[PDB]
Design a binder for this molecule. Structure first.
Ligand code: BEF
Ligand SMILES: [Mn+2]
Ligand SMILES: [Mn+2]
Ligand SMILES: [Mn+2]
Length: 128
């Protein structure tokens, strides 16, 4: 994928955003912004430029499933890749996110290898 691809990393806890931002750096992506909830995210997204979203589920203001649904329902960003990264591991959550259009889904805690594999899976599926 283009190493200038702009990522938005969303989670209500800085620890997790920090892990993901650093992993992306390792993979060669330095164009990375953070958001703290679904609303914060949509604000940055509607500020334009973004090529990929990585998002938590449980967050105040707007959760990640609502964020995913909003993104997929907006004609201007409906195809934006959205990778869920969340502690929700139940099959009903995976189903609900998948059905809502998640590009991929990683369960916390995750390894560096896992994030890399699932990002690449999405890149390949989308021809990025
Ligand atoms: F808060 Be997340 F869903 F891990
Ligand atoms: Mn914090
Ligand atoms: Mn744009
Ligand atoms: Mn959370």
């Amino acid at each position: 994928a283009d190493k200038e691809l702009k990522f938005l990393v969303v989670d209500d806890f800085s620890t997790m955003r920090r892990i993901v931002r650093n992993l992306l750096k390792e993979l060669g992506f330095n164009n990375v912004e953070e958001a703290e909830d679904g609303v914060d995210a949509l604000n940055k997204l509607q500020a334009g430029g973004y090529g990929f979203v990585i998002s938590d589920w449980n967050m105040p203001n707007m959760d990640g499933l609502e964020l995913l649904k909003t993104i997929r329902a907006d004609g201007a960003m409906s195809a934006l890749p959205v990778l869920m990264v969340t502690m929700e591991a139940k099959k009903e959550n995976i189903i609900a996110a998948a059905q809502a259009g998640a590009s991929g889904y990683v369960v916390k805690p995750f390894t560096a290898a896992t994030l890399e594999e699932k990002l690449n899976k999405i890149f390949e599926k989308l021809g990025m």
